[PDB]
Amino acid sequence: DSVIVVDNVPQVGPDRLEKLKNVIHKIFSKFGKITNDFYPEEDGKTKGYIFLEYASPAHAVDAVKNADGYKLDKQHTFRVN
């Protein structure tokens, strides 16, 4: 109850890959400050999921209920749980 997870999060090319984790810090900054951030992969290839942990339960349990599906304007929405 102190962490968040997202789904349908593919990688992107250069000049934008940074934005992927950067925008995470900006969007989640209104609820508090993120302390833990992990971006796993499959055989060194394109991921689809990430793992973020907050310094408090009230940040995670809030963020999940505030950022439920990001609007990246691509194809399919995300699922923050």
Partner: peptide
């Protein structure tokens, strides 16, 4: 990331 629309959080 910058001063633009929050196109990363569906209300």
């Amino acid at each position: 990331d910058e001063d633009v629309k929050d196109n990363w959080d569906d209300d």
